[PDB]
Amino acid sequence: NPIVLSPTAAVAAVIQRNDNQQGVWTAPANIALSKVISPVRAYIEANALFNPDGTSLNLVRSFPGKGIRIWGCRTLENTHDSPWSYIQTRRLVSYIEA
Amino acid sequence: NGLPADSITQPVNALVAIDSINQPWVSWNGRPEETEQAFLTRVSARLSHRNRVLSWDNIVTLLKEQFVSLFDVKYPSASELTKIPAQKEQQLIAIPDSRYKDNDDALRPILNPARLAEMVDWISQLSSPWTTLKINNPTYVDVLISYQLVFVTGINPDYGRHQLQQELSRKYMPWAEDSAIGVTTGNRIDYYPLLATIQQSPLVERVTNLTLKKSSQTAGAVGDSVEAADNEVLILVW
Amino acid sequence: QFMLPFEQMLANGCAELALLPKLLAFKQRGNTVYGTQWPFKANTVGQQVHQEIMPDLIKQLNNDSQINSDDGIHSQNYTKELSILNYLLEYFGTHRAARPLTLDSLDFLSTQRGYLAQQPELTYQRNNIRIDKVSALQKRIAARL
Amino acid sequence: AELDNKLSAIVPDTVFKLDERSTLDILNWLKAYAEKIPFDQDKNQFWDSFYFIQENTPEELEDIYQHANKADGLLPPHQAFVFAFLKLLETSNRLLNTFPARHRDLYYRELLGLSPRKAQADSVALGITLNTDNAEYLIPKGTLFDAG
Amino acid sequence: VTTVSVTDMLTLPLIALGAGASLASGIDYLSLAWQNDLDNLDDFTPGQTLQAQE
Amino acid sequence: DALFPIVKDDIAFETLLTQAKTVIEQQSGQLWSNTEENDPGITLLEACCYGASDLAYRHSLPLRDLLTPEKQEQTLGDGIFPQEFGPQQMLTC
Amino acid sequence: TNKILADIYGRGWAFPPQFFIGERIPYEDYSSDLNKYLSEKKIEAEQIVKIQACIKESVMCYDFHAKITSTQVSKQTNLPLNILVTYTLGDSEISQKIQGVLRVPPQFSIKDNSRTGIAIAEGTQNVLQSINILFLTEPGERIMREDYGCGLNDYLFANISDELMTDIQTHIEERVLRYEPRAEITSIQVNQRTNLPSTLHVQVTYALRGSD
Amino acid sequence: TNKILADIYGRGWAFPPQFFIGERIPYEDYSSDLNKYLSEKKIEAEQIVKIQACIKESVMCYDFHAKITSTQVSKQTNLPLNILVTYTLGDSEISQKIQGVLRVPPQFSIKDNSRTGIAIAEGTQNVLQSINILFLTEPGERIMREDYGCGLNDYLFANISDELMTDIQTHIEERVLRYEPRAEITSIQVNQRTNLPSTLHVQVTYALRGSD
């Protein structure tokens, strides 16, 4: 039977790879994953998990002909005017801070 | 059809010592390859009787397959399967094709007794040992037919009557005219189907009276059919 | 709802082909003469939309396919089954019996189906008789009538 | 069509039809099937009145389908959609109806192993006349003669 | 001969395009189904492997 | 015993779509004249055309495979035809 | 002029698909010819032709392929008149019926919900809708037409920068040229929304083929 | 998927050659048909088809060209059933026998040491083994095939340096291209062992032809 895994393992590889290729200021979303057969649940069940003015998830999704891709770049920040609403923005400033 | 007479006249390879070649007669022992429709028919018959004789249909089917001189084979009516004293001999009636008749009359073909013995011998080889099948020539019985007619205007009555005789003889005596049409084996002559047949001729306008009379019995009334015994074949006469 | 009738006729065609081993079977024939099925599975978007009308449409599908149902004998399906049996019987040089005029329709179908299903035994033992066993001659008489 | 030409060449098409339902029967099925799908419930509207407009019967639609000229490109588009779909299914129906013939051939030829009988060579009798300069001649077995 | 792996939300025409990219003459969805002995045009599951010849 | 090598060109999606567009022209040519890739009526029909092609492909499978039911039904000692229908029981007596 | 544009550019199904069913006709109410009814009511003779001209003109506007064959009056309106109109489309053998309201210049009105079928797009609306479908379709979604589509999903989540706006603009130009020959793109404007900083607004302006 | 790879990439003898002889069958113990034995033991009729399906499936995995013709039960096990299976390979006339253990869902097990013959390599293992043979063969060793081989013996006793590492890597790439078309070399790593300074470790990574 196929082994079920969390998406965070593959996302970390993408983030590390994306830094050298595109840069730390580039969002790691919209990148196809590897060795993934299918997501456990379809994208039609995640209509309540994205809030433009609140807390939201990052969806892992598949497309016909594009494979399974990451479809989000937001953090757990929920404030509308907060400057850390995106992962790449928060990581860019920490890269400047370092 | 076979090879027509006087077809071969010279050999394929020229030989100076050979003059004309005489081929007075046609070829024989020829048979075309089986067509798909005939193949299915033969196999279906084989799966039914298994090349053995038990029932009346098995006798008729196997005999007609083996012998080409047969036009139809008759077996006793259902009124004799209830006969209590049983029957020593199973009697069949063979109506041969007029082309293979051993006599002069085309309307009443008769087979040589030597031919009938061969069929009995052949059929007995595929039957139970406790059966005795006998095949005999039919007993032809004349059925006098007289009708009063109204012909289409402009047609001479004698000419119309002559043509009507030929049409009815073809219809009700199929074995006479080169056995090309499958028609009832001279069992019954129904009054009204016969009346419909007469009026279908283009020369006939209307039938005003029709009467059928057997050889010995009195003439029947309107709408009376004619039966035949298990050894009889009815023949229309005028 | 617009696409549903076209999905149904495609699903029936798929179901009709899957019914082929039973339609042409020499023995153990079934109760249906046409293939039908509900196009959608469970927990699907299509199933939820047609949730309320599914029992009625499925009832119509069963009625249009089964020879015998709760309503009784389906005349057209009855006629079709007779034609299939007659076609299969012609394999072995026989034919279907005449339709009954004063007999039971269900009983008549049993005679024809048993006649076809037991063709090898009936003709191989055409003249055999044994004690406490229905003879082949009796079966042939019943099938013909 | 081209499919029929290449199918009848390898399949002995028979009278019996596994699926004999015509376009009229299919249209009648659609009329009954669509009578149960509701368009809206405030009115008594069902989809059967959408595929068959007003006082239209399956007999009338079947006549139009068989003769495309008697509409001259003015049939409602959604009914042309149905007619187009019916044309699509005709190919699948044609392929299925070839199975009764292939089924019988498999039984007769593969299981029972029966094959059609081959033709039989005929025989003839020939009379020979020799040329006047030969007293006797020998014609060996196997000499070939021409019949045209 | 080329080999491909079936992922989620893939159709047979899409699989033929990916599989037939390397092939000299490509492949059509009907030929690809026949070579893989598919029971129907959707008779495959994610994680399965398919093959395509010339 | 399979019809696919014979009819693989008549089952294709493009061949069936050509027939469908011909009917639309003949029946409703003056009211439905845009039949390109973008017409919503065509996309619904094109999907149905693919489904029709899939149905026809199923019929072109090998004959012996289409006569085989599920494994849970297949009777022991039989085949495509039951054992008693073989040559040793149907041609003998 | 709408007929001229529709013939040049074509007619087809509207997007998204919509369906209608017209109201039922109470056939048991129309069993009286309108011409005999008007003549019986001693209405003027020249009113008959003017009345019929209004009916023909109003029906032709509703459907210009119509050919009036008969007309009848509802029995429950004996002078606001309810008329059932019967017509044939072109030289076909198909007949259809339609309700209407006549008022005595004479005025004729058509019942609002009378047509059964789909919604259609004509001329300029057809090509405008055609471009809209291209934008909303991604390649690989259309069966057996895997190339068709615009494919703007590939530019999502990219940093909003001058490179991205030019990539979007040039992508639209190439895809419309490939999949829409009846339209010509004259201007594309890409801007970032002030109230929603993460969204891009694209303004596309098109002209018809040979419109000048 | 192993069947698909084996057909595409071929199959043959395994390296190094290995030989097996299966255990002797005590033929004097199997003289009773299993189906008769199961029916005599008042087993359920539908259980029988599951019995036969399990044996067929188990033999299917053991040898997929098999075709079962007979099934017999050992007389020393009358309710753990010892079974002797008789099958024919494909449409051939060759028949073979194989022991098994049946337990009553039912499962069927095969005796461990039952195959007689050689060890075979299939699919990916065939290609991997093929490259291994190339590395271990020096040119001139093969009769009538004097060029076949890698030829890494020529680089022994050379000073460990960048020049030697480059020469070894490029030599492997050239030879594999010449003598192994079913594989594609993707990376070659040459490193010097710390614990054994005089030995070089070569890491070779390969991909199958047309795998992606």
- Of the candidates F61, F50, C57, the one whose C-alpha atom is nearest the C-alpha of residue D85 is F50
Q: Name beta bridge partners: B145.
A: B212
C-alpha to C-alpha distance for F30 and G71, rounded to whole angstroms? 26
Q: Best residue in B41, B48, B52 to probe C by mutation, most C CBs within 10 Å? A: B48
Residue C128: closest C-alpha in chain B: B54
F6 Cα to chain G: minimum distance (Å): 22
> Which residues of C are less than 8 Å from D47 in CB distance?
1-2, 5
Q: Which residues contact A73 (CB under 8 A, 6 or more apart)?
A: A27, A28, A29, A58, A86, A87, A88, G157
CA distance H21 to H174: 41
Residue B97, C-beta contacts closer than 8 angstroms, at least 6 positions apart: B68, B69, B70, B71, B109, B175, B178, B179
Query: Cα separation of E3 and H209, whole Å?
Result: 9
Q: Which residues of F touch H49 (CB under 8 A)?
A: 72, 74, 76
**Structure resolution, Å:** 2.7
Residue H193 is encoded by which pair of tokens? 């062992």
What is the spatial distance between Cα B210 and Cα C43, in angstroms, rounded to a whole number? Answer: 80
User: Is residue H110 within 8 Å of H62, Cβ to Cβ?
Assistant: yes
Sign of CA dihedral H117, H122, H127, H132: negative
Helix/strand/coil for D46: strand
CA-nearest of A88, A97, A90, A94 to A19 is A88
Nearest CA to G11 out of G89, G116, G123 is that of G123
In DSSP terms, which residues pair with D123 in a beta bridge? B28
Residues of chain F with Cβ-Cβ distance to D71 below 8 Å are: 26-28
CA distances from G58 to D76, G5, G48, G65, G111 (A): 21, 21, 15, 12, 12
SS3 B237: strand
Q: Which residues of D touch C64 (CB under 8 A)?
A: 29
Say which amino acid occupies B207: V
Tokens of G115: 């047509």
| Helical spans, DSSP H, in chain C | 4-18, 20-23, 45-49, 54-65, 75-89, 105-117, 119-124, 136-144
Q: Do B29 and D146 touch (CB under 8 A)?
A: no
Instruction: Collect all residues of chain E within an 8 Å Cβ-Cβ radius of residue H182.
Output: none
- DSSP characters for F23-66? HHHHHHTTT----STT-HHHHHHHHHHHHHHHHHHHHTS-HHHH
Distance CA A77, CA A60 (A): 19
DSSP state string for H51-106: HHHHHHHHHHHH-TT--EEEEEEETT----EEEEEEEE-TTSS-EEEEEEEEE---
What is the residue type of A42?
A
Interface of H with E in 8-67 (CB under 8 A): 8
Q: Roughly how many angstroms between the first and final C-alpha of chain B, as a whole number?
A: 36
Helix, strand or coil, per DSSP, at residue B95: strand
H-helix segments, chain B: 36-49, 56-66, 113-124, 157-172, 191-199
Q: How many CB atoms lie within 10 A of CB H35?
A: 15
One-letter-per-residue 3-state SS of chain G: CHHHHHHHHCEEECCCCCEECCCCCCHHHEEEEHHHHHHHCCCCHHHHHHHHHHHHHHHHHHCCCEEEEEEEEECCCCCCEEEEEEEEECCCCCEEEEEEEEECCCEEEECCCCCCEECEEECHHHHHHHHHHHHHCCCCCCCCCCCCCCCHHHHCCCCCCHHHHHHHHHHHHHHHHHHCCCEEEEEEEEEECCCCCCCEEEEEEEEECCCC
Separation CA D73–CA G89 (nearest Å): 10
| Bridge partners, residue B28, by sequence | D123
- Determine the Cα angle at C86 with ends C85 and C92, to 5°: 100
Q: What is the helix (H) or strand (E) element at residue C68, kind and residue range?
A: strand C68-69
Q: What phi and psi, each to the nearest 5 degrees, are found at residue G19?
A: -130, 145
Q: How far is G184 from chain A (nearest CA, A)?
A: 29
For residue H174, CA distances in Å to B30, E19, H184 come to 75, 28, 11
Is the bond leading into B202 cis (omega within 30 degrees of zero)? no
Distance from CA of B125 to the nearest CA of F (A): 15
Judge: F11–E41 Cβ closer than 8 Å, yes or no. no
Residue pair C40/C46 in contact by the 8 Å Cβ criterion: yes
Choose, out of D60, D75, D82, D107, the residue to mutate when testing the contact with F (most F CBs < 10 Å): D75
**Cα–Cα dist C109/C117, whole Å:** 12
Distance, in Å, from the CA atom of G140 to the CA atom of E8, rounded to the nearest integer, reads 13
The Cα–Cα gap between F19 and F17 comes to 5
- Using a CB-CB cut-off of 8 Å, the residues of chain E touching A38 are 7-8, 46
Which residues fall within 8 angstroms of residue D41, CB to CB, at 6 or more apart?
Answer: none
Q: Which amino acid is at A43?
A: Y
In this complex, the chains that touch A, judged by 3 or more CB pairs closer than 8 A, are E, G
B51:F93 CB<8 A: yes
Distance, first Cα to last Cα, chain D: 41
Distance CA G50, CA G40 (A): 17
Residue whose structure tokens are 């008007």 = G38
Q: Record the tokens describing residue H170, joined without a space.
A: 């490029």
Tokens of G75: 């029995």
> Which of C123, C73, C118 shows the shortest CA–CA distance to C99?
C73
Our CA angle for F61, F63, F64, nearest 5°, is 115
What is the maximum span of chain D, computed from C-alpha positions, in angstroms?
115
Which residues have CB under 8 Å from C60's CB, separation 6+? D32, D33, D36
Closest CA to B43 of D115, C144, D10, D106: D115
Are G59 and G82 spatial neighbours (Cβ–Cβ below 8 Å)? no
| Residue G196 touches chain E, beta carbons under 8 Å | no
- DSSP bridge pairs for G84: G72, G99
Q: How far is CA G10 from CA F21, F25, F31, F36, in A?
A: 15, 13, 9, 11
Question: On the CB side of B115, how many CA atoms lie within 13 Å of its CA?
Answer: 17
The two structure tokens encoding residue D66 = 């068989």
Amino acid (1-letter code) at residue B203: L
Residues in a beta bridge with G88: G67, G95
Residues 6+ positions from G37 with CB-CB distance below 8 Å: G73
Read off the tokens for B233. Answer: 């074949």
End-to-end CA distance of chain F: 31
A65, A70, A73, A76 alpha-carbon torsion, rounded to 10° = 140
């259609």: which residue's tokens?
A: G120
**Residue from the list F10, F63, F91 with its beta carbon closest to the beta carbon of D112:** F91
G140 chain-A contacts, CB cut-off 8 A: 63-66
DSSP A86: B
What's the gap between Cα B219 and its chain centre? 26
- To the nearest whole Å, the CA of E42 is away from the closest chain A CA by 14
Q: How many CB pairs under 8 A join B and F?
A: 8
Which amino acid is residue C124, in one-letter code? Y
CA gyration radius, chain C: 20
Contact flag for A and H (3+ C-beta pairs < 8 Å): no
CA distances from D12 to B109, C70, C86, F3 (A): 40, 39, 19, 14
Residues of F in CB contact (< 8 Å) with H are 71-72, 74, 76
Name the CA dihedral angle for G143, G146, G150, G156, rounded to a multiple of 10 degrees.
100
Instruction: Note the residue count of chain C.
Output: 145
Please write down the HEC assignment for all residues of B163-191.
Answer: HHHHHHHHHHCCCCCCCCCCCCCCCCECH
